[PDB]
RNA sequence: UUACCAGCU
């Protein structure tokens, strides 16, 4: 159940083993007979009685945890001492000491209280400070240091995972952002925080119907206005008598004039200046992240309340992150038509791809170019450069059919497109003056669904003379050759008569929560051509037909049927992993089996997760740095047949590994032959020459899902299923 | 869309 083929590397991970003083805590169950009545009463009486008997604890309704046995193991109190004056029969019953399963929740509560002791606020699911900000003053911004803490049971033991996060908050006030707007979707996700009390509330509604003159209830129903209360409490005022307000449901009202938005808005997401200004702060190298880790753990063991609480619960934690032994997979041989290039440590061959011929090239006897009269010169020079650069890379290209669209609007483009495309024509390229998503969507709708024509769209800006021409032509020629059903490079995959399948779902709130599911399955021994389908429903029953159709395509192409079927599942949360095993695997097992006669394929189902809080650093001596791409971590953190792989190379900052969780293995593949396989599949992406994060079938499936949900909104035509039209 | 990684009120 463990990999075995790879040279070991020294690595480390942001984890803290917690000492095993677990057995001490004893559990008491509480019982209340006559009134019951909720917590206010439960807290009061339990407080008094159990405090005389003992101190500390957690009591969530019925269960109660205390480190020591109560002075009486069974104790009965008979007085509610409430306003009514009735009686309550308190029944304390000691049960075992603590279950192995139940310790995790207890230490979770304890550590969240510990972190609250340090003055750190809890925003989102994260713990951020509010008195030590890194500040970028250009665009009214800064960063708040943050710690992403979680106590969970991993195979190594009861482990606290720590991770340094940063949360952008704007010095500008919500009133100024509203003035800029003069946006229901944007604010609801953001957790807007108040400035006067430095308290944080997730926002739900943005209501301008209400007015500040309306006064909220307080002091037993007395109506007091917001401005008077804020002046009395926090010593500030609201300048605007009439203003929009924000609503959060626990009736909580937030005033924009004192509210500063956290997070970065969609306009800020698009604006490149904001991203590049933030990146130097938010993106942290590995050495500074290690230094922040050791500063945090030094801070935790020095403050008074935190130091006392840990010894009160009798747990002492290590003083440094965990060290471990990952293994580096050998670099793989990337195979071009007439030469082979072994990728460097950076795992990039973008320069080399320019100078070598593609494996199999669809000779461009004819292709078309649409353009506007303004960019006619741009189109001509681009076509000339493209014709110049193609013969070096093996493709053979002829001069196009050039059509000048009457107007830049998409409708004229469509009117030309219907007449232009023919069964003979292999591809159409399009010139665009402005980058607008609707025009791209209409073009891709015609090209993918309504008519079977692969196509490429180019906005004018990237082709505005200078040295843009060579780079853009060389990075568009390969994309065109990939869209024409031709392969650029290859790697040697030992697996024979295997059909790797990649499933990833793109949750789109806009399109009625359709949960667009991708489905990409190889149809070649060399894993260079693919069959693409997409399943959508309001997945359960469309995956059936997608899988049967893919099996039929493989049978049509290879005159056989596969013995192995490897399924990589993405887009599923950590909680819902068991749901997939319960409901999806048996359905697949029966569904392809029933069609045909006595056909039983193996179905290896592996779940892939990108968003994780685990970090793997490397060292050689004392300095902490990023590990080279291609390192596996399979032991001491992995639980029940999983592993971690680093495959991406980052120019600035640290690497985020990828989690792989084998939820159902019946294929007979070794864990090592699956690890190496999913590493080799990482180089199979034809848009980026080099490695990526997620395996190539899953990345293709994610792009297919994104294209179908964001742009096409329907099923791409079955004619283009064989071609990677979505690249 | 040239292309990869981010009590409060
Ligand atoms: Mg994911
Ligand atoms: Mg593309």
From TrEMBL:
The answer to whether keyword Cytoplasm applies is: yes
User: What are the subcellular locations of this protein?
Assistant: Cytoplasm
Q: Which residues of the full protein are shown?
A: 230 to 987 of 987
Q: What is its main location?
A: cytoplasm
Which gene does this sequence derive from? EfPiwiA
Question: Which amino acid positions bind Mg(2+) 1, per UniProt?
Answer: 504, 702
Any one annotated GO CC term: cytoplasm
Report residues binding Mg(2+) 2: 570
So what family is this one in? Answer: Belongs to the argonaute family. Piwi subfamily.
Put simply, this protein is called Piwi
Domain Piwi: from-to ranges: 427-713
Q: Which residues cross the membrane?
A: none
Give a GO molecular function annotation for the protein. RNA binding
